[PDB]
Design an enzyme around this catalytic site. Structure first.
Site, PDB file in Angstrom:
ATOM      1  N   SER A 142      66.539 -10.932  28.938  1.00 39.75           N
ATOM      2  CA  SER A 142      65.868 -10.487  27.571  1.00 39.75           C
ATOM      3  C   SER A 142      66.865 -11.438  26.618  1.00 39.75           C
ATOM      4  CB  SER A 142      65.806  -9.136  27.338  1.00 39.75           C
ATOM      5  OG  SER A 142      65.503  -8.886  26.166  1.00 39.75           O
ATOM      6  N   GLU A 168      56.100  -6.404  30.850  1.00 40.68           N
ATOM      7  CA  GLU A 168      57.092  -6.717  29.758  1.00 40.68           C
ATOM      8  C   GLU A 168      56.897  -5.771  28.489  1.00 40.68           C
ATOM      9  OE1 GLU A 168      59.673  -8.430  30.094  1.00 40.68           O
ATOM     10  OE2 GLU A 168      59.442  -9.825  31.597  1.00 40.68           O
ATOM     11  N   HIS A 201      60.191  -4.096  31.318  1.00 42.90           N
ATOM     12  CA  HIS A 201      61.434  -4.961  31.127  1.00 42.90           C
ATOM     13  C   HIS A 201      62.754  -4.415  31.277  1.00 42.90           C
ATOM     14  CE1 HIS A 201      62.466  -7.939  28.012  1.00 42.90           C
ATOM     15  NE2 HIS A 201      63.343  -7.337  27.826  1.00 42.90           N
TER      16      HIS A 201
END
Ligand code: NAG
Ligand code: CL
Lengths: 532, 537
Positions: free
Chosen positions: B203, B328, B441
């Site tokens: 990320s 995500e 995520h």
């Protein structure tokens, strides 16, 4: 003197001809006048009803084709000759044809009224593909078809004037419809069961009779094959009509009254010579003289009228063919020929799109390109070529149809939709064109039933099926064979969006007519354009 | 010295270290935890670039994790593991510039390839000491030398008055770069090969790895790069200088700090907690996947926008592995989209969808949001709450991660990089987020680090085997620039990603499967079309 071939209609006596259909005789009354010839001072004017005649009028041959542009792009080629006039051109062309069963039907028979296409610039009720003999014999249908004026003669308007009000070709059609109400009983037709059907511009005309109140009392059901009154090509505004008319006037050496009078003094071919020189840009699927939003025949735009209309007591059958857009690419898109395979490249594709969507801004064109590119194979020429076809087909036919089907279903109509997917074995256009616009007609009309025509025996059974759907629909408002049990053709609705594929396989139900891509054309693209 | 473990005493440039012998499932590992690499960035040093840690005397104890950088702590769901696992696990303090090293035990005889982890957390949070970043399994099982560092986040790491001397911006990135320099200098003392250093991050760590690829002075510090669910390009990873100036002076206002020198000086007198308390109040719109203080395009660390630099960079020498999780977007929905919750199915209405889209694409004009809605609506079932819920997740995921990653992969590939691409698709059997969130995520991380190898963690056997596979891909890639096992063709191969073929692989319980096009249609909407709808508004 066969008493079956003698009919008295309201304006006098007619004599038809006995014709041979593969399974029996049919009575045919060809070239019946339904209007005074719209010649001389009557050019551009509404049609007036035909005066009574003495004795027996010979109605055994097709009359003249309405004066029109003739396609000579591929001279000698069957793919084109089949749409060309097969009779003398003349402004004296307001005649209709009636095929009935032989003998004359015992009880009142459902009537099918065919309205040909040709972009409002061409066509004729006399083409072999519109031969009503098969439907009349096999199904016992009374089948009518009319000539209506095309091009300038039918659609040149100086909106607001008295001598060229526009939509006169639609008025010709309406008058043939009125004629049917008044006279079809004499042939064993049921004036109380009239189904309009039509293809392409014929389809848009049918849609226009749907959206025009004085026409509504003249039929009960409608079939629109590959065309709609809504969409980018079927209509023009009063302002754009006036503009094209005055530009044609200028192009031929010509106050409304004076301009129209000058136009009336010109040989027909002079008008046809400059017909194709009034379009605002280089385009395909765009036509100079088309019905006009006049506040009269069309009280508002088609889009406005289908959004707000009430369609409670109306059945409609609508559909498209698998490749609505292929045909047109060869008529002005660089990279396309019927003679090779037209494997284009990206730049040709982007330029193709400014031609296929002529009204498109830079951004809009881009949105189209980006939607229709296969991003896994951005530069694959086969995809790009198929994409160009799809753009043209979707924008002009499939999406306008999905929109129409949707609005009519939402606003009370019973709607049946189809996609036609059988390419005729006898087709002379190349393979890459698939199932082009117009190539379902020969099947609905029943032509494979004529052993002389070399259709396969599967095609002959297919044709019989389609004739049944169409005439079932004409009979009941429902195309399903009631009996037998062939899965059922369900009505199209805005919730389920069901439509059927018409091909050699039995009916298959599918949902959503290009639903994602038509959302693009029908919902998003308008927003993009209404930012200049 | 005298009585202690001879394997645990190491010298680095700043002095002497004592580490700890740690148990991994397959045997012992060496760990050196909380090694200082910068002067504590405190007092007058707040907002300022880090300075190298002054040498110390005696033996530094490097047996425990050190402070976590000052940050916002998520308390939305008390006791909930789904959120707790990401929360600081050591004291919050501005004195946090420390790093960690894990090596085989005893230490490798010859130079071992080095993996450097950069944690995510949106640039407002994170810590190299979280359980999911435990380097022990990669060290014990693959013989890796693993290094992870704390870097400053939020205002402390990213508040910028661009142009100024006292708050230049990007200093968290500079903390990371200093730890890269520390590794170049000191890693061979642990048996690590400074000539074989792979960055991996997830990320914002991924975005971070990306900035290092794009910033010259970082280039010489590593050789290969892994970017997990993040890119330096995309709508959240950077701000313009103007915008950072805006956010920084607004934050200053909020804390009663009313030229740059005088303002920054005032900010430096503020307790850290005040800065954190007002950190979220400076974003231009109601939004998700947008963070107040992030890397700034300063014309220095970042010489131009990441988009500019990836479009025109030469990436001859570059091996890059990049990928995304299957879902995500799902995680973010429960933070600020009305209708969404971890505690129910989150079946939303069309109206909550259109609202959701405004929040998730907060830069969108009305036309742009219309386009998004138009594209993501299923026109057969436009009111179906399950589809709308999933489309909302997809919008957020696609826009912030998947399409930025596709864009990155394509540009890098077109310009000489060897690029491997993956979509991670297995949901942890232990996940505590609801099923509708799919594979959110962050949830690949525990697999890549080999946590399922720990019998006490409750993973399934298949998960244990899957983790080993993933650790092999990652460390093969670190060793060679190629995730594939050279002495093995019984397994299917991972092809490079290319602009021509656009191949990537699925990572799940099943053997590798090769797929073509990374959301190619949809990403053409976000990457090619959408920019232009923001040009001619
Ligand atoms: C997993 O399972 C054990 C024993 O079956 C249970 O008691 C424990 O609380 C669980 N631990 C974890 C780390 O999930
Ligand atoms: Cl996927």
């Amino acid at each position: 003197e066969d008493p079956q071939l003698l009919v008295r209609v309201r304006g006098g006596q007619l004599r038809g001809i006995r014709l041979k259909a593969p399974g029996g005789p049919v009575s045919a009354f060809l070239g019946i006048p339904f209007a005074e010839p719209p010649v001389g001072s009557r050019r551009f004017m509404p049609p007036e009803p035909k005066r009574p005649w003495s004795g027996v009028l010979d109605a055994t041959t097709f009359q003249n084709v309405c004066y029109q542009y003739v396609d000579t792009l591929y001279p000698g080629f069957e793919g084109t000759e089949m749409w060309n006039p097969n009779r003398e051109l003349s402004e004296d062309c307001l005649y209709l044809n009636v095929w009935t069963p032989y003998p004359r039907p015992a009880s009142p028979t459902p009537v099918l009224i065919w309205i040909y296409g040709g972009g409002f610039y061409s066509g004729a009720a006399s083409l072999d593909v519109y031969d009503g003999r098969f439907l009349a014999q096999v199904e016992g249908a009374v089948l009518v078809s009319m000539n209506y004026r095309v091009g300038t003669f039918g659609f040149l308007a100086l909106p607001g004037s008295r001598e060229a009000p526009g939509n006169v070709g639609l008025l010709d059609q309406r008058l043939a419809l009125q004629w049917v109400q008044e006279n079809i009983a004499a042939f064993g037709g049921d004036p109380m069961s009239v189904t309009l059907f039509g293809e392409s511009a014929g389809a848009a005309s049918v849609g226009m009779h749907i959206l025009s109140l004085p026409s509504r009392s003249l039929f009960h059901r409608a079939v629109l094959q590959s065309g709609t009154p809504n969409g980018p090509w079927a209509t023009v505004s009063a302002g754009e009509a006036r503009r094209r008319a005055t530009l044609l006037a200028r192009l031929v050496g010509c106050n409304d009254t004076e301009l129209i009078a000058c136009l009336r003094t010109r040989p027909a071919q002079d008008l046809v010579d400059h017909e194709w020189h009034v379009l605002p840009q280089e385009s395909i699927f765009r036509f100079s003289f088309v019905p006009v939003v006049d506040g009269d025949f069309l009280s508002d735009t088609p889009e406005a009228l289908i959004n707000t209309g009430d369609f409670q007591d109306l059945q409609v059958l609508v559909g498209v063919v698998k490749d609505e857009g292929s045909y047109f690419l060869v008529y002005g898109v660089p990279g396309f020929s019927k003679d090779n395979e037209s494997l284009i490249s990206r730049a040709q594709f982007l330029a193709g799109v400014r031609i296929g969507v002529p009204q498109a801004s830079d951004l809009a064109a881009e949105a189209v390109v980006l939607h229709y590119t296969d991003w896994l194979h951005p530069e694959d020429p086969t995809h790009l070529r198929d994409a160009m076809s799809a753009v043209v087909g979707d924008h002009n036919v499939v999406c306008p149809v999905a929109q129409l089907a949707g609005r009519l279903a939402a606003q009370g109509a019973r709607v049946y939709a189809y996609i036609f997917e059988h390419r005729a074995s006898t087709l002379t256009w190349p393979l890459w064109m698939g199932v082009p616009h117009g190539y379902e007609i020969e099947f609905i009309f029943g032509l494979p039933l004529d052993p002389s025509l070399n259709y396969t025996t599967e095609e002959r059974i297919f044709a019989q099926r389609l004739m049944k759907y169409w005439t079932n629909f004409a009979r009941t408002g429902d195309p399903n064979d009631p009996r037998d049990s062939s899965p059922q053709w369900p009505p199209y609705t805005t919730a389920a969006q069901q439509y059927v594929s018409l091909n050699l396989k039995p009916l298959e139900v599918r949902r959503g007519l290009r639903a994602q891509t038509c959302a693009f054309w029908n919902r998003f693209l308008p927003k993009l354009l209404s930012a200049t």
